[PDB]
Design a binder for this molecule. Sequence first.
Ligand SMILES: CCCCCCCC/C=C\CCCCCCCC(=O)O
Ligand SMILES: CCCCCCCC/C=C\CCCCCCCC(=O)O
Ligand SMILES: CCCCCCCC/C=C\CCCCCCCC(=O)O
Ligand SMILES: CCCCCCCC/C=C\CCCCCCCC(=O)O
Length: 415
Amino acid sequence: ASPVQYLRWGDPAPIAAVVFACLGLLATLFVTVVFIIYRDTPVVKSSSRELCYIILAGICLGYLCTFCLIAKPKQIYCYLQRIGIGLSPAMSYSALVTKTYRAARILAMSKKNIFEMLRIDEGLRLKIYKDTEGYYTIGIGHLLTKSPSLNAAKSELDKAIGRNTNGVITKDEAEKLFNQDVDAAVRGILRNAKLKPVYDSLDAVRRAALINMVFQMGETGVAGFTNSLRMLQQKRWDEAAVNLAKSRWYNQTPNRAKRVITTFRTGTWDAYKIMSACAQLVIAFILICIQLGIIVALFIMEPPDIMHEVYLICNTTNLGVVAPLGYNGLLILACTFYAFKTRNVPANFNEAKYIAFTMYTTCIIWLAFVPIYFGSNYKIITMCFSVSLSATVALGCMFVPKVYIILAKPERNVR
Ligand SMILES: CCCCCCCC/C=C\CCCCCCCC(=O)O
Ligand SMILES: CCCCCCCC/C=C\CCCCCCCC(=O)O
Ligand SMILES: CCCCCCCC/C=C\CCCCCCCC(=O)O
Ligand SMILES: CCCCCCCC/C=C\CCCCCCCC(=O)O
């Protein structure tokens, strides 16, 4: 009848879900108006604002589902229940997986440049060899094993590549091996206090130049260029260029040092030799249309109907929940994969950090939703609270920090 009547009767649940949904709707409208009024601010215009609007619409639909699950005895409401509870997480996570996939592609294309730089400078061997220390190595100085068995080296190489290599790889396989080495080198940099301040206060190209220097001499040797590192930190490229040209490393390996110094100076890859926007909308549209087609197919197979109360009970069985839940869970898994592969990306004021934390919480909440909902005797209220909680964790972990930066730190809103 009425949630207030159920509160007066002794059930403090329907009116609570209504208040939750109303607060969520008000918060979604607040965040949307903030992001529209401040569309040209660098914090908003740096991400996919259209995909952000798609995610906001998903959150709003997830909150509106409570008014469908707690409504009057009507048929269109039994339809809109399934539509909303299937499309809200779909609408959010399709845009989210598009964003995370584009971020992962950007990261791969960024590492490709360092691979090309150190292929030009250091070199590469597609067959297994031994380093000067006498240990099995292949590619751009990638250690296979410290053990003295060529068969063990080939075993670890096959285990790392995933194919019967027989001691021979390709350039892309060598790039895959080189990505782990550059990750380890960056970790070694961020742990030394004589290299981390410069590394964090640089752009990508100069970070790559410093990585090349570390690959050539080591972190302890690169830490010797104290004055030049401080010049680079203070964005004094023209002076650091000369001070590096005065070095003994420049006189021992001049050809590579010239390119590294020119890279440090100009900030471009000119010294060496080396995803659309409307496409993301269409991809998210297709991913949402797949879920909508699932929903329509279940409408045709199992037509909605009132079973037969403030709860509009419908004939929604378990399959009509399992299939959309399954597709949304696959979306969540892909989202989590691509957001974990990009967890340390600092773009958009470290947006991927909050994205990854939100994806972790969503995975946990859904893994808990399965046995809680399916082993429950109050399924409508649990569905209400679960959808509202997922929308809430999304809106709070992803959009609340941005609105906080906009409406409280207007000076940090700079590229
Ligand atoms: C920071 C701003 C405040 C945020 C918290 C707002 C809290 C709102 C909570 C619910 C309001 C009261 C619910 C209405 C009770 C209905 C019972 C009746 O009217 O008879
Ligand atoms: C009446 C339902 C609740 C209305 C409050 C929520 C309003 C925002 C809803 C979803 C955000 C995405 C929809 C609009 C996108 C931005 C509009 C635009 O840029 O033209
Ligand atoms: C501050 C935000 C919350 C303010 C209090 C809002 C709670 C009371 C509002 C009305 C709830 C009506 C919900 C509609 C469901 C009843 C329809 C039905 O049961 O058939
Ligand atoms: C970007 C995603 C936009 C999604 C917004 C909401 C989606 C609503 C889409 C159309 C609903 C049509 C459902 C079919 C009607 C019932 C008839 C039937 O299936 O037999």
